[PDB]
Design a protein around this nucleic acid. Structure first.
Ligand SMILES: Nc1ncnc2c1ncn2[C@@H]1O[C@H](COP(=O)(O)OP(=O)(O)OP(O)(O)=S)[C@@H](O)[C@H]1O
Ligand SMILES: Nc1ncnc2c1ncn2[C@@H]1O[C@H](COP(=O)(O)OP(=O)(O)OP(O)(O)=S)[C@@H](O)[C@H]1O
Ligand SMILES: Nc1ncnc2c1ncn2[C@@H]1O[C@H](COP(=O)(O)OP(=O)(O)OP(O)(O)=S)[C@@H](O)[C@H]1O
Ligand SMILES: [Mg+2]
Ligand SMILES: [Mg+2]
Ligand SMILES: [Mg+2]
Lengths: 325, 166, 261, 319, 258
DNA sequence: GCAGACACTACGAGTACATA
DNA sequence: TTTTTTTTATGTACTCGTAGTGTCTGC
């Protein structure tokens, strides 16, 4: 039936075959499940890569719908997970048998980096003592906020960023299941602006399809507000080729015409600053100045002065690069 | 029972002559405990930082026949023999050691009902029973209200008749 | 349109005070047969199956079947200010969120209408096996509550055994062990105080005391409780209300590992 | 029945099967054979075998009296101030009939989680009842255990397991499990373990379940190379004011999905123990802290980490 | 093998409630003559000497002399669930670490078997307290409990003075002064209320109220109590039970006289 | 049948720390 | 050869004191 859902939740990989990228990790987890050798897992990686979807597909594969509420204990950062919960419901769930059917139980701890260190220290002997009865899956974005004692007990899988070559067919499946007219440059802009994230590629696809009705390069870069590659090349050419006043006028006209933001301009100019074969003394100064300009934009600071400083960081090094020869 | 006990408990000092502390501290604690013989045992005869202790050992008594410092405080780094010196000096001067350490409840009501029991009563063995020397181990872990209870029972003018070692 | 009518308010107060520290949220399944509630606890160890009959209410009408999930702290605060001898009306519309509790003051003069907002949890149905048990014991509820309270002072996990002789409770704790065994207490003037054994095969299972003590809070609901045990199916505590329905408590055994030696 | 993972299935039950720290493990074997064991606190890195050594020593000392002459407490238990007074002291006062040279053993696993008040209350009940009971504590951070408790026990310290010590136990597990392997695969497992036997067994079981053979690429398709092994190289490149190679390593760590907090934590961890000038090390640490304040306040991009690397390279050329 | 079948659990309940907050442990000494318990406080303030002879039980089996050092709270936790009029089987082995109590307390054929883990204590020895008391009086237990509660209402310590006329109790406080005068009350029908005086050389001492209340909490244990006090010898209360034995409480006086 | 006493858990309050 | 005190803004955890309150005893 038709449902009113966001496309990041309407199109969720309910099975392990619907995830795209981490084929070796998913093959190893599938062979863990099929041989009943599932250990305590530690899924870590950047957001939007499919860790919660992986553990929910594994839990739906392991357990039927008539027994899913008694075998799976799913706790996350929206739940209270203090040390009284580790000593309370989690220990009682781990230390007791099942109700309906005999089997091993699963305690999913989503956002395990949000737990306090007291709870993580209390979890160690709960994990180690009841390995036969229950299994634990810790999922985090930052591995440093998990204590090394819990990192030793759980085998860790790095759910790295999704490569855009493998991100395309899932987006094509979502497009063909939603009747969306998309061009090749629209798909390329989607997998460029996503940057290893399938949430942001679905959100941007749904937002562009609602705003314009078609998904092309211009529509995606207009709905997102991101500058194009040609605009960044023009900004760099103006900052390296002419004086302060003409470059300031041209960049100000380009920003007023297309409604660009200085954060995305700074990000793309930072990406361009390493491809350009600059001297090493020039690159250090440019990176320090651009990091300072990016830091100044985090508060109530006028963006026009920061645009002038972004021009100034290159107008300083123009004559240095030229006289270097 | 050589294989039954630890080597610290096997080689623990049982007399004054086999202690390993500073001899000045041993003599000062022994003289401070022997200053209570006029009010505890009822006998006139028993048988820098050093200068203040020597002055306080010879400073005289209050008209209530007691030393002017009714509490001895023993401080130092761990692993020296402070508890050993307190127990050896208490058993050497004819006292019976009453121990009150950090494994007790240390609430002010329990602290009061233990100090008042150890210090304000005589012996249940009648004549010839040893007096009670209250040794309070780990007093720095006690709460401030327990210290206020100890100071209130030290400054009751309910007069304190027994020595207290902290 | 759902409209039930409790003739007295005491039984609903006892039910919602029995489940207050145990059940996270109440799922009233409404049909023409009666009111059903199958809900697990917050630890996913216990299970509560309450079945209230349509003949026990004053008036009961139910056009279409409903499944009303509601919070329990709010309903506990509503039922705290309810009398024990007043008629309490539960109302619910077809496509609305307001579950209405209408009752009277303890002064019995003014009316009170307390609405509740229904929750939207999608809960998969838990399949009760309804199989035969290897041990069925009919015993008084007050003695069961007393023996659970007396074993709570000794330990935390209790080994309950049952055989042809009778039920037996053991608590191997820190002070020591406490082993209480009861049997054949039917030779009294009362009919509620009786121990009857029906089934054959002896079973020994270890359970938590906190959940047993939460289960014993339904003592005023039934004078006689039933204990069902087997080697695979969990512990069932059955309270049979007089003319309203019944209440089932399911508690899973704990994981006990023998010594390697 | 369900098969246990190889961490829990191949836990050693005898003290001779424990590899690494041969002097301390040999003395624990002697103490388990004879008796009269002093109070013991074992400190070390995770996965070294401290809990295994404590449990094997307690089992070999007691035998059939393990269920009545041992009290095991963890961080999953309460062990507050009301448990040291009322449970540990009552177990130390408890009469258990034991052979000569054998005592009751109170195992306090993960003693860092205990509060300071509980450790203060533990002192006199450890010192008084030492004729009848003994204490066997295990910990990771030895500074959390206070000085009187460390004075009341023998403080054994475990070091990280060497590659040969991990390799011997892994070859025992391989010959027990009939795992086909190559030498570069076991070298990769030893490299990804980093002194942790738990991680070695977990990586070996993951590679054997996912691929069925142990070579280097089958290990690295599921396991990962350690972070500080490249962070040390990028810090060395920042010392020589080489911003291009440092940014190459930074971009390689960025494209692998590491958050800026983890990257700057590894950068601080390497710079804390790096071999360079002390004043330059302090300037590096101050610049890392200044960047980490911006990372924690909300701005955390590749431009900020590149600016941190540029500032570290500028600190070299500005005496 | 030690077995002792106490015919009624009421005396065990009243004893273990009398020395509940008084002594920290129970050191039962087991011989063929009976059960002895000689406990002393750590501050040497109060002493308990309980003797239960073998003729006062339903049965008594004892092969070897035993020392049962057991916790007080762990036994109070047992006999909060015991029966007032029921048979209590206290059993132990010769070389064992446990102590079992079997009873049918609710009179509902509910076989309750509570085991305790023995506590190993250092074997201090107190041989015999010397008994040469000049002032020996006899008093009912209920009146003594009521007058100890009456001074507990006002003061914190009792000045007890023996005399030929009677035992006079005094208490000082900010709210008021509590004072009674004991007279010869032998002209009544009850023989338990009669006060028999066998004193000489009168003595006035001071005692703590809390230990006196803990001693007088055993009023239903025996109908009549015996008080024995003298100079520099601690005060003795003595409850003579009907068939099982006797109980003696020793209280040391305070240093601050009067 | 109703006043007094007992322990019981829920709740209010004060304090410390949070890193490698 | 040398020692007092409360600010940082939440969130959690520990510890301790206090107050309704269910239940037991007694005349
Ligand atoms: N590998 C993937 N295959 C298909 N859809 C994906 C994949 N990764 C992410 N998605 C989409 O993103 C949604 C949410 O992914 P999550 O499971 O939340 O990823 P995650 O990496 O666990 O996120 P964090 O780290 O918890 S914010 C899914 O329901 C999909 O719509
Ligand atoms: N002369 C001695 N020879 C051998 N062992 C000794 C000697 N004096 C003391 N000891 C032992 O060394 C320890 C002395 O510490 P204690 O006096 O018990 O406590 P402490 O010295 O106050 O240190 P802390 O702060 O309590 S840890 C005990 O284990 C004694 O048995
Ligand atoms: N030295 C060792 N020899 C053999 N196996 C070991 C060794 N160390 C660890 N293991 C294995 O790793 C498992 C975990 O060992 P533990 O003793 O629990 O680690 P740990 O030293 O306690 O570290 P932490 O601080 O508790 S996480 C054991 O059950 C063994 O399977
Ligand atoms: Mg997620
Ligand atoms: Mg000491
Ligand atoms: Mg461990």
């Amino acid at each position: 039936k038709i449902r009113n859902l966001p496309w990041v939740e309407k199109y969720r990989p309910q099975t392990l075959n619907d995830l795209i990228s981490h084929q070796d990790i998913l093959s190893t987890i599938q062979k863990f499940i099929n041989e009943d050798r599932l250990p305590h897992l530690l899924l870590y990686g950047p957001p939007g890569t499919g860790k919660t979807s992986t553990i929910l597909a594994c839990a739906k594969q392991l357990y039927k719908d008539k027994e899913f509420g008694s075998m799976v204990l799913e706790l996350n950062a929206s739940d209270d997970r203090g040390i009284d919960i580790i000593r309370g419901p989690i220990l009682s769930f781990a230390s007791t048998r099942t109700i309906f059917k005999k089997g091993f139980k699963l305690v999913i701890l989503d956002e395990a980096d949000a737990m306090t260190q007291d709870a993580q220290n209390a979890l160690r002997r709960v994990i180690e003592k009841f390995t036969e009865n229950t299994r634990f899956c810790l999922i985090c974005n930052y591995l440093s906020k998990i204590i090394p004692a819990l990192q030793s007990r759980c085998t860790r899988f790095r759910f790295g960023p999704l490569t855009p070559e493998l991100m395309v067919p899932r987006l094509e499946h979502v497009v063909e299941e939603e009747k969306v007219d998309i061009s090749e440059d629209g798909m390329k802009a989607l997998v460029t602006l996503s940057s290893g994230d399938m949430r942001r590629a679905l959100n941007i696809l749904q937002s562009t399809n609602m705003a314009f009705g078609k998904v092309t390069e211009e529509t995606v870069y207009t709905c997102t507000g991101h500058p194009l590659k040609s605009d960044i090349a023009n900004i760099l050419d103006w900052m390296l080729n002419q004086d302060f006043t003409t470059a300031y006028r041209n960049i100000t006209e380009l920003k007023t015409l297309k409604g660009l933001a200085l954060h995305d301009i700074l990000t793309e100019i930072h990406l361009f600053v390493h491809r350009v074969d600059f001297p090493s003394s020039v690159r250090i100064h440019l990176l320090t100045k651009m990091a300072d300009i990016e830091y100044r934009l985090s508060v109530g600071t006028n963006e026009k002065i920061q645009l002038s400083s972004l021009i100034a960081a290159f107008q300083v090094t123009r004559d240095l690069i030229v006289a270097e020869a | 029972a050589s294989s039954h006990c630890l080597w610290v408990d096997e080689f623990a000092p049982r007399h004054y002559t086999e202690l390993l502390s500073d001899d000045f501290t041993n003599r000062c604690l022994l003289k401070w405990l022997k200053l209570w013989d006029l009010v505890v045992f009822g006998h006139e005869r028993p048988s820098s930082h050093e200068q203040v202790l020597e002055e306080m050992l010879e400073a005289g008594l209050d008209p209530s026949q007691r030393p002017k410092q009714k509490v001895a405080l023993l401080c130092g780094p761990p692993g020296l023999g402070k508890t050993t010196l307190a127990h050896v000096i208490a058993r050497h001067a004819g006292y019976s050691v009453v121990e009150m350490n950090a494994s007790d409840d240390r609430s002010p009501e329990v602290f009061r009902t233990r100090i008042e029991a150890a210090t304000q009563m005589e012996s249940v063995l009648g004549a010839g029973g040893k007096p009670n020397c209250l040794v309070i181990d780990e007093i720095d872990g006690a709460p401030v209200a327990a210290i206020n209870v100890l100071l209130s029972i030290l400054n009751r003018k309910g007069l304190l008749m027994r020595p207290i070692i902290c | 349109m759902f409209e039930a009518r409790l003739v007295q308010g005491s039984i609903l107060k006892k039910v919602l005070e029995a489940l207050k520290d145990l059940i996270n949220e109440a799922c009233w399944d409404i049909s023409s047969s009666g009111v059903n509630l199958q809900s697990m606890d917050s630890s996913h160890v216990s299970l509560v199956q309450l079945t209230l009959r349509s003949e026990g209410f004053d008036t009961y009408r139910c056009d279409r079947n409903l499944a009303m999930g509601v919070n329990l702290t709010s309903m506990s605060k509503i039922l705290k200010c309810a009398g024990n001898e007043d008629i309490i009306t539960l109302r619910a519309e077809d496509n609305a969120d307001t579950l209405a509790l209408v009752f009277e003051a303890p002064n019995q003069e003014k009316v009170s209408d307390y609405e509740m907002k229904l929750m939207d949890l999608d809960v998969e149905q838990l399949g009760i096996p309804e199989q035969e048990y290897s041990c069925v014991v009919k015993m008084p509820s007050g003695e069961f509550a007393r023996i659970c309270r007396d074993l709570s002072h000794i330990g935390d996990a209790v080994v309950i055994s049952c055989a042809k002789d009778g039920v037996k409770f053991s608590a191997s704790g820190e002070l020591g062990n406490g082993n209480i065994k009861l049997s054949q207490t039917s030779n009294v003037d009362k009919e509620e105080e009786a121990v009857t054994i029906e089934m054959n095969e002896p079973v020994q299972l270890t359970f938590a005391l906190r959940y047993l003590n939460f289960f014993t809070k339904a003592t005023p609901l039934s004078s006689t409780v039933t204990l069902s045990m087997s080697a695979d199916v969990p512990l069932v505590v059955e309270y049979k209300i007089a003319d309203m329905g019944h209440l089932k408590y399911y508690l899973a055994p704990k994981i006990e590992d023998e010594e390697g030696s | 029945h369900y098969e246990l993972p190889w961490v829990e299935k191949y836990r050693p039950v005898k003290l001779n099967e424990i590899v690494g720290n041969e002097d301390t493990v040999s003395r624990l074997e002697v103490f388990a054979r004879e008796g009269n064991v002093p109070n013991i606190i074992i400190a070390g890195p995770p996965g070294t075998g401290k809990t295994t050594s404590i449990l094997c020593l307690a089992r070999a000392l007691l035998g059939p009296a393990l269920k009545d002459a041992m009290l095991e407490l963890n961080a999953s238990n309460d062990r507050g101030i009301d448990v040291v007074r009322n449970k540990i002291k009552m177990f130390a006062q408890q009469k258990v009939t034991l052979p000569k040279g054998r005592h009751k053993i109170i195992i306090l696993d993960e003693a860092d989680s205990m509060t300071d008040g509980a450790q203060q209350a533990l002192r006199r009940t450890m010192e008084i009842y030492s004729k009848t009971t003994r204490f066997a504590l295990a910990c990771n951070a030895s500074d959390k255990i206070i000085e009187p408790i460390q004075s009341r026990c023998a403080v054994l310290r475990y070091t990280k397991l060497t590659d040969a010590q991990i390799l011997t136990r892994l070859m025992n597990v391989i010959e027990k499990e009939r795992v086909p392997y190559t030498d570069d695969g076991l070298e990769a497992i030893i490299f990804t373990a980093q002194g942790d036997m738990r991680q070695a067994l977990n990586n070996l079981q993951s590679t054997f379940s996912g691929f069925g053979f142990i070579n280097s690429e089958n290990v690295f398709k599921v396991c990962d190379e350690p972070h500080p092994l490249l962070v040390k190289e990028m810090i060395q490149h920042c010392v020589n004011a080489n911003i291009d190679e440092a940014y190459k390593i930074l971009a390689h760590l960025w494209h692998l999905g590491y958050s800026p907090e983890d990257i700057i934590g590894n950068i601080f961890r390497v710079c804390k123990t790096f071999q360079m000038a002390e004043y330059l090390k302090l300037e590096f640490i101050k610049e890392i802290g200044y960047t980490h304040m911006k990372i924690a306040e909300g701005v955390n991009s590749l431009l900020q980490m590149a600016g941190l690397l540029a500032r570290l390279c500028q600190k070299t050329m500005a005496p």
